[PDB]
Short mmCIF file of C-alpha atoms and ligand atoms in Angstrom, two decimals:
data_model
loop_
_atom_site.label_atom_id
_atom_site.label_comp_id
_atom_site.label_asym_id
_atom_site.label_seq_id
_atom_site.Cartn_x
_atom_site.Cartn_y
_atom_site.Cartn_z
CA UNK A 1 81.18 129.17 193.44
CA UNK A 2 81.91 132.82 194.17
CA UNK A 3 85.64 132.79 194.87
CA UNK A 4 86.87 134.05 198.23
CA UNK A 5 89.70 136.60 198.45
CA UNK A 6 92.01 133.80 199.67
CA UNK A 7 91.23 131.48 196.73
CA UNK A 8 91.67 134.52 194.47
CA UNK A 9 94.85 135.30 196.40
CA UNK A 10 95.95 131.67 195.72
CA UNK A 11 95.73 131.86 191.89
CA UNK A 12 97.35 135.27 191.53
CA UNK A 13 100.14 134.38 193.95
CA UNK A 14 100.42 131.00 192.30
CA UNK A 15 100.88 132.55 188.84
CA UNK A 16 102.87 135.75 189.39
CA UNK A 17 105.23 134.24 191.97
CA UNK A 18 107.19 132.26 189.40
CA UNK A 19 106.88 134.92 186.65
CA UNK A 20 108.71 137.71 188.46
CA UNK A 21 111.09 134.98 189.58
CA UNK A 22 112.18 133.77 186.16
CA UNK A 23 111.60 136.98 184.22
CA UNK A 24 113.70 138.61 186.93
CA UNK A 25 111.22 141.39 187.70
CA UNK A 26 111.87 143.78 190.60
CA UNK A 27 108.34 144.94 191.34
CA UNK A 28 104.83 144.13 190.14
CA UNK A 29 101.35 145.53 190.60
CA UNK A 30 98.39 143.43 189.49
CA UNK A 31 94.64 143.89 189.92
CA UNK A 32 91.80 141.44 189.40
CA UNK A 33 88.16 142.46 188.97
CA UNK A 34 86.23 139.34 189.97
CA UNK A 35 82.50 140.00 189.59
CA UNK A 36 83.20 143.71 189.21
CA UNK A 37 84.87 143.90 192.62
CA UNK A 38 88.49 145.05 192.69
CA UNK A 39 91.18 142.96 194.39
CA UNK A 40 94.71 144.42 194.48
CA UNK A 41 98.12 142.75 194.72
CA UNK A 42 101.66 144.17 194.79
CA UNK A 43 105.09 142.54 194.94
CA UNK A 44 108.68 143.80 195.13
CA UNK A 45 109.95 147.32 194.80
CA UNK A 46 109.43 150.47 192.83
CA UNK A 47 113.02 151.47 193.64
CA UNK A 48 115.62 148.67 193.93
CA UNK A 49 118.33 151.05 195.12
CA UNK A 50 116.35 153.27 197.51
CA UNK A 51 114.61 150.19 198.94
CA UNK A 52 111.05 151.43 198.32
CA UNK A 53 108.39 148.86 197.45
CA UNK A 54 105.51 148.45 195.04
CA UNK A 55 102.59 150.29 196.58
CA UNK A 56 98.96 150.50 195.52
CA UNK A 57 99.77 154.15 194.68
CA UNK A 58 103.00 153.41 192.79
CA UNK A 59 103.06 154.91 189.31
CA UNK A 60 103.95 152.60 186.41
CA UNK A 61 104.68 153.63 182.81
CA UNK A 62 101.86 152.06 180.71
CA UNK A 63 103.82 152.09 177.47
CA UNK A 64 101.30 151.43 174.70
CA UNK A 65 98.34 150.91 177.08
CA UNK A 66 98.52 154.69 176.79
CA UNK A 67 96.80 154.11 173.38
CA UNK A 68 93.47 153.15 175.03
CA UNK A 69 93.28 156.68 176.43
CA UNK A 70 94.10 158.23 173.03
CA UNK A 71 91.28 156.22 171.47
CA UNK A 72 88.68 157.07 174.13
CA UNK A 73 89.77 160.71 174.02
CA UNK A 74 89.28 160.60 170.23
CA UNK A 75 85.88 158.95 170.77
CA UNK A 76 84.69 161.68 173.17
CA UNK A 77 85.69 164.29 170.55
CA UNK A 78 83.85 162.23 167.93
CA UNK A 79 80.65 162.08 169.99
CA UNK A 80 80.79 165.83 170.50
CA UNK A 81 80.77 166.09 166.67
CA UNK A 82 84.21 167.75 166.79
CA UNK A 83 85.88 165.27 164.42
CA UNK A 84 84.71 162.42 162.15
CA UNK A 85 86.66 159.20 161.45
CA UNK A 86 86.05 159.81 157.75
CA UNK A 87 87.62 163.32 157.86
CA UNK A 88 90.58 163.91 155.51
CA UNK A 89 93.87 164.15 157.43
CA UNK A 90 94.56 167.35 155.58
CA UNK A 91 91.51 168.97 157.22
CA UNK A 92 93.37 168.96 160.54
CA UNK A 93 96.83 169.73 159.23
CA UNK A 94 96.59 171.72 156.01
CA UNK A 95 100.33 172.56 156.20
CA UNK A 96 100.91 168.87 155.44
CA UNK A 97 101.15 169.02 151.65
CA UNK A 98 101.52 166.04 149.34
CA UNK A 99 99.28 163.70 147.36
CA UNK A 100 100.24 160.60 149.40
CA UNK A 101 97.82 162.02 152.00
CA UNK A 102 94.73 162.79 149.93
CA UNK A 103 92.84 159.49 150.46
CA UNK A 104 93.92 159.01 154.06
CA UNK A 105 91.22 159.77 156.64
CA UNK A 106 91.11 159.85 160.43
CA UNK A 107 90.15 156.15 160.59
CA UNK A 108 93.39 155.26 158.78
CA UNK A 109 95.54 157.10 161.35
CA UNK A 110 93.59 155.94 164.35
CA UNK A 111 93.64 152.31 163.19
CA UNK A 112 97.11 151.90 161.64
CA UNK A 113 95.86 151.27 158.08
CA UNK A 114 97.18 154.44 156.38
CA UNK A 115 99.71 152.71 154.11
CA UNK A 116 102.53 151.59 156.39
CA UNK A 117 103.37 154.56 158.63
CA UNK A 118 106.32 153.39 160.71
CA UNK A 119 106.22 151.79 164.11
CA UNK A 120 108.22 154.71 165.51
CA UNK A 121 109.17 158.22 164.34
CA UNK A 122 112.89 158.39 163.42
CA UNK A 123 114.12 159.84 166.75
CA UNK A 124 116.34 162.15 164.58
CA UNK A 125 112.95 163.84 164.30
CA UNK A 126 113.03 165.70 167.62
CA UNK A 127 111.04 168.85 166.85
CA UNK A 128 107.77 169.58 165.03
CA UNK A 129 109.60 171.28 162.18
CA UNK A 130 111.02 167.80 161.63
CA UNK A 131 107.73 165.87 162.21
CA UNK A 132 106.14 167.62 159.22
CA UNK A 133 109.18 166.96 156.91
CA UNK A 134 108.91 163.34 157.98
CA UNK A 135 105.23 163.13 157.12
CA UNK A 136 105.82 165.34 154.11
CA UNK A 137 108.29 162.90 152.60
CA UNK A 138 106.67 159.65 153.78
CA UNK A 139 106.19 157.00 151.13
CA UNK A 140 103.23 154.63 151.54
CA UNK A 141 103.95 150.92 151.08
CA UNK A 142 100.26 150.24 150.32
CA UNK A 143 97.08 152.10 149.43
CA UNK A 144 94.84 152.84 152.41
CA UNK A 145 92.63 150.14 153.91
CA UNK A 146 94.84 147.39 152.51
CA UNK A 147 97.24 146.31 155.20
CA UNK A 148 97.32 146.82 158.94
CA UNK A 149 100.71 147.85 160.35
CA UNK A 150 100.76 148.65 164.12
CA UNK A 151 102.57 152.02 164.49
CA UNK A 152 103.11 154.81 167.03
CA UNK A 153 103.42 157.42 164.27
CA UNK A 154 99.96 156.50 162.98
CA UNK A 155 97.77 156.64 166.10
CA UNK A 156 100.16 159.23 167.57
CA UNK A 157 99.23 161.56 164.69
CA UNK A 158 95.52 160.82 165.33
CA UNK A 159 95.71 161.88 168.98
CA UNK A 160 97.40 165.15 168.09
CA UNK A 161 95.00 165.92 165.26
CA UNK A 162 91.88 164.82 167.07
CA UNK A 163 92.23 167.50 169.76
CA UNK A 164 92.87 170.33 167.26
CA UNK A 165 89.27 171.45 167.04
CA UNK A 166 88.88 171.92 170.82
CA UNK A 167 91.86 174.27 171.06
CA UNK A 168 93.39 172.32 173.97
CA UNK A 169 96.83 170.66 173.74
CA UNK A 170 96.63 166.83 174.06
CA UNK A 171 97.66 166.77 177.75
CA UNK A 172 94.99 169.36 178.60
CA UNK A 173 92.11 167.59 176.77
CA UNK A 174 93.20 164.32 178.22
CA UNK A 175 93.09 165.78 181.76
CA UNK A 176 89.89 167.79 181.52
CA UNK A 177 87.98 165.38 179.30
CA UNK A 178 88.85 161.85 180.56
CA UNK A 179 91.13 161.95 183.58
CA UNK A 180 89.10 164.40 185.66
CA UNK A 181 85.63 163.01 184.89
CA UNK A 182 86.74 159.45 185.77
CA UNK A 183 88.60 160.75 188.83
CA UNK A 184 92.04 159.44 187.73
CA UNK A 185 93.90 161.58 190.22
CA UNK A 186 96.91 159.28 189.93
CA UNK A 187 97.15 159.07 186.14
CA UNK A 188 99.59 161.49 184.59
CA UNK A 189 101.36 162.41 181.38
CA UNK A 190 103.61 164.90 183.20
CA UNK A 191 104.33 163.52 186.64
CA UNK A 192 104.45 166.38 189.09
CA UNK A 193 107.35 167.14 191.39
CA UNK A 194 104.85 166.27 194.14
CA UNK A 195 104.37 162.69 192.87
CA UNK A 196 107.90 161.69 191.94
CA UNK A 197 108.06 159.78 195.24
CA UNK A 198 105.50 157.29 193.88
CA UNK A 199 106.98 157.02 190.41
CA UNK A 200 108.76 153.71 189.95
CA UNK A 201 112.10 153.23 188.20
CA UNK A 202 111.87 150.83 185.22
CA UNK A 203 114.74 148.34 185.07
CA UNK A 204 116.80 147.60 181.96
CA UNK A 205 119.90 145.46 182.46
CA UNK A 206 119.75 146.47 186.12
CA UNK A 207 119.61 150.17 185.31
CA UNK A 208 116.74 152.39 186.53
CA UNK A 209 115.11 154.13 183.54
CA UNK A 210 112.27 156.53 182.71
CA UNK A 211 110.69 156.99 179.28
CA UNK A 212 112.30 159.75 177.26
CA UNK A 213 110.75 162.75 175.56
CA UNK A 214 109.62 161.93 171.99
CA UNK A 215 107.43 163.45 169.26
CA UNK A 216 103.99 161.91 169.91
CA UNK A 217 105.16 160.33 173.16
CA UNK A 218 102.09 161.26 175.15
CA UNK A 219 99.62 160.14 172.50
CA UNK A 220 101.11 156.69 171.91
CA UNK A 221 103.16 155.53 174.94
CA UNK A 222 103.58 158.21 177.62
CA UNK A 223 100.92 157.78 180.31
CA UNK A 224 101.84 157.03 183.89
CA UNK A 225 99.35 155.47 186.20
CA UNK A 226 98.80 153.43 189.29
CA UNK A 227 97.16 149.93 189.64
CA UNK A 228 94.38 151.75 191.67
CA UNK A 229 93.77 154.07 188.73
CA UNK A 230 94.24 151.36 186.04
CA UNK A 231 91.48 149.30 187.70
CA UNK A 232 89.04 152.27 187.62
CA UNK A 233 89.91 152.80 183.94
CA UNK A 234 89.25 149.10 183.22
CA UNK A 235 86.01 149.29 185.22
CA UNK A 236 84.83 152.32 183.25
CA UNK A 237 85.74 150.69 179.89
CA UNK A 238 84.26 147.37 180.91
CA UNK A 239 80.93 149.24 181.42
CA UNK A 240 80.35 152.88 180.41
CA UNK A 241 76.81 153.34 181.80
CA UNK A 242 78.51 154.24 185.07
CA UNK A 243 80.05 157.24 183.29
CA UNK A 244 78.05 160.38 183.92
CA UNK A 245 79.48 162.42 181.02
CA UNK A 246 77.40 161.73 177.92
CA UNK A 247 80.26 162.30 175.47
CA UNK A 248 82.95 160.40 177.41
CA UNK A 249 80.52 157.46 177.69
CA UNK A 250 79.76 157.23 173.95
CA UNK A 251 83.44 157.76 173.30
CA UNK A 252 84.21 154.55 175.21
CA UNK A 253 81.47 152.82 173.22
CA UNK A 254 83.20 154.08 170.07
CA UNK A 255 86.75 152.95 170.90
CA UNK A 256 85.44 149.39 171.49
CA UNK A 257 83.40 149.43 168.24
CA UNK A 258 84.90 147.15 165.53
CA UNK A 259 86.32 148.89 162.43
CA UNK A 260 88.44 146.22 160.73
CA UNK A 261 88.97 142.46 161.03
CA UNK A 262 92.51 141.04 161.00
CA UNK A 263 91.78 137.40 161.22
CA UNK A 264 89.93 136.60 164.44
CA UNK A 265 90.99 139.95 165.87
CA UNK A 266 89.10 143.20 165.52
CA UNK A 267 90.41 146.73 165.85
CA UNK A 268 88.70 149.54 167.79
CA UNK A 269 90.40 152.76 168.95
CA UNK A 270 93.51 151.74 170.89
CA UNK A 271 91.61 148.66 172.12
CA UNK A 272 91.78 145.35 170.26
CA UNK A 273 89.03 142.79 170.74
CA UNK A 274 88.28 139.16 170.12
CA UNK A 275 84.93 137.29 170.11
CA UNK A 276 84.57 135.48 173.51
CA UNK A 277 84.98 132.63 174.21
CA UNK A 278 88.56 132.88 172.85
CA UNK A 279 91.32 130.28 172.06
CA UNK A 280 94.17 130.83 174.49
CA UNK A 281 96.46 130.07 171.54
CA UNK A 282 95.05 132.81 169.32
CA UNK A 283 95.80 135.63 171.76
CA UNK A 284 98.90 134.12 173.31
CA UNK A 285 100.50 133.75 169.85
CA UNK A 286 98.97 136.82 168.15
CA UNK A 287 100.74 138.91 170.82
CA UNK A 288 104.09 137.85 169.44
CA UNK A 289 106.47 140.40 167.88
CA UNK A 290 106.07 138.28 164.74
CA UNK A 291 102.29 138.73 164.34
CA UNK A 292 101.58 141.78 166.46
CA UNK A 293 104.18 143.90 164.63
CA UNK A 294 103.63 142.40 161.17
CA UNK A 295 101.91 143.98 158.17
CA UNK A 296 98.67 142.09 157.77
CA UNK A 297 95.63 142.07 155.49
CA UNK A 298 92.65 143.83 157.09
CA UNK A 299 88.96 143.47 156.38
CA UNK A 300 87.15 146.79 156.67
CA UNK A 301 84.02 146.42 158.80
CA UNK A 302 82.24 149.63 157.66
CA UNK A 303 79.85 150.66 159.11
CA UNK A 304 81.79 149.64 162.20
CA UNK A 305 80.27 146.87 164.33
CA UNK A 306 79.08 147.86 167.83
CA UNK A 307 80.83 147.04 171.11
CA UNK A 308 79.41 143.69 172.24
CA UNK A 309 79.71 142.44 175.79
CA UNK A 310 81.05 139.05 174.64
CA UNK A 311 84.49 140.15 173.48
CA UNK A 312 87.94 139.97 175.06
CA UNK A 313 89.13 143.59 175.22
CA UNK A 314 92.80 144.18 175.87
CA UNK A 315 96.01 146.00 175.19
CA UNK A 316 99.72 145.44 175.67
CA UNK A 317 102.39 148.12 176.23
CA UNK A 318 106.15 148.39 176.69
CA UNK A 319 108.75 151.00 177.49
CA UNK A 320 112.49 150.55 178.17
CA UNK A 321 112.05 149.51 181.78
CA UNK A 322 108.34 148.68 181.65
CA UNK A 323 105.97 145.90 180.69
CA UNK A 324 102.18 146.42 181.01
CA UNK A 325 99.04 144.44 180.17
CA UNK A 326 95.30 145.00 180.57
CA UNK A 327 92.47 142.60 179.67
CA UNK A 328 88.74 142.42 180.46
CA UNK A 329 85.58 140.46 179.58
CA UNK A 330 82.66 142.89 179.72
CA UNK A 331 80.16 140.07 179.76
CA UNK A 332 81.76 138.27 182.71
CA UNK A 333 82.80 141.48 184.51
CA UNK A 334 86.34 140.16 185.00
CA UNK A 335 89.53 142.09 184.21
CA UNK A 336 93.19 142.17 185.03
CA UNK A 337 95.80 144.89 185.29
CA UNK A 338 99.43 143.70 185.27
CA UNK A 339 102.03 146.42 185.73
CA UNK A 340 105.72 145.53 185.98
CA UNK A 341 108.85 147.72 186.14
CA UNK A 342 111.02 145.64 183.75
CA UNK A 343 110.17 144.91 180.11
CA UNK A 344 109.58 141.21 179.43
CA UNK A 345 108.13 139.09 176.62
CA UNK A 346 104.53 139.86 175.64
CA UNK A 347 103.09 136.34 175.30
CA UNK A 348 104.50 135.64 178.78
CA UNK A 349 102.33 138.40 180.23
CA UNK A 350 99.38 137.36 178.11
CA UNK A 351 99.64 133.66 179.00
CA UNK A 352 99.88 134.65 182.68
CA UNK A 353 96.89 136.93 182.29
CA UNK A 354 95.08 133.87 180.89
CA UNK A 355 96.07 131.31 183.53
CA UNK A 356 94.54 133.48 186.25
CA UNK A 357 91.43 134.51 184.38
CA UNK A 358 90.83 130.99 183.14
CA UNK A 359 90.81 129.98 186.79
CA UNK A 360 88.18 132.57 187.61
CA UNK A 361 85.72 131.85 184.79
C1 AZR B 401 103.79 150.11 173.03
O1 AZR B 401 103.98 149.62 174.13
C2 AZR B 401 104.78 149.98 171.94
N1 AZR B 401 106.18 150.20 172.32
C3 AZR B 401 106.98 150.99 171.53
O2 AZR B 401 106.51 151.51 170.51
C4 AZR B 401 108.34 151.04 172.11
N2 AZR B 401 109.04 150.02 172.42
O3 AZR B 401 108.55 148.73 172.19
C5 AZR B 401 109.35 147.94 171.32
C6 AZR B 401 109.75 146.64 171.98
C7 AZR B 401 108.47 147.50 170.13
C8 AZR B 401 110.49 148.89 170.89
O4 AZR B 401 111.69 148.73 171.17
O5 AZR B 401 110.27 149.93 170.21
C9 AZR B 401 108.77 152.17 172.99
C10 AZR B 401 108.24 153.43 172.97
S1 AZR B 401 109.03 154.33 174.17
C11 AZR B 401 110.01 153.08 174.63
N3 AZR B 401 110.94 153.20 175.61
N4 AZR B 401 109.76 152.00 173.93
C12 AZR B 401 104.62 148.80 171.02
C13 AZR B 401 105.30 148.87 169.67
N5 AZR B 401 103.36 148.07 171.06
S2 AZR B 401 103.14 146.82 172.16
O6 AZR B 401 101.67 147.05 172.67
O7 AZR B 401 103.15 145.47 171.31
O8 AZR B 401 104.23 146.81 173.22
#
């Protein structure tokens, strides 16, 4: 039976109540899409100290959910015939000399299968003069297409390279090409002076903290957004037909296309999918630092496989003071946006995201 807001309210309240409680979270913003209808919930505060609560306009740092944007942005550019996954990395950054790079294409970067590019850029690399040196001296652990090693410095470099052709900086392309078309008027990279009053404080050992500047920050973990906006983003990704821009639409279709298989999990652009129906255990345990962050053997699906409605699309993200999670089942038109201003364990988030959902399918 078609759940009623109050039965929906029951599940969500039932689940999140105790989470915040035991994970010691200050404020939370969660959204459920139940039969493609948005239902919003918000608990606690955005600012402990200045006693301001979690609003449906409150801005949360998305950490690595930022990557979904990067991947769709790259997909739009692909559709426009501006870039090609197969394109040599050199093509976009000729200055970047050194034979370690010759067989490394845009797919490698996008999908973290270049040869073990690190999870983060040595923050002693705080300028672009230094980002090239870094990449100039990098030493691959494995030949391309061998292992899969989640990394900011990988996809981060894709984002930055993928907008080269267009002549816009990343922030500008992002805005113009994805954010404006979708009407994400509350989704920022550089939060205006005007919006600072809606920008939550992330908590870390009781300290209020905002994500610091960082080479490739924007492209891998620097997008700020609100649960209203996150829900529209999920809605658009969960079904692209609604998208009027031809290129942005295809782009979304591209980022949810399957490029590699890493045992039961498939890799798109930013987005990671699983065949549905899915084993709670697979995704609750595959989300663990120990699997998620490990170098694993990947099976090249090339030509890529096409976005199928019976998949479990999703993406996790963290930042000092922030924990974020997004999941959606295209086929069932269900989704969930969980935004918290305190970083907590991944599989916690993911198991919570499952309890609810499970209850609504
Ligand atoms: C994305 O959320 C991403 N996070 C990072 O790369 C950073 N921190 O996360 C861990 C816990 C791994 C870290 O200490 O580095 C990060 C970037 S800016 C900031 N304040 N933290 C990770 C690696 N992927 S996720 O989707 O599994 O969280």
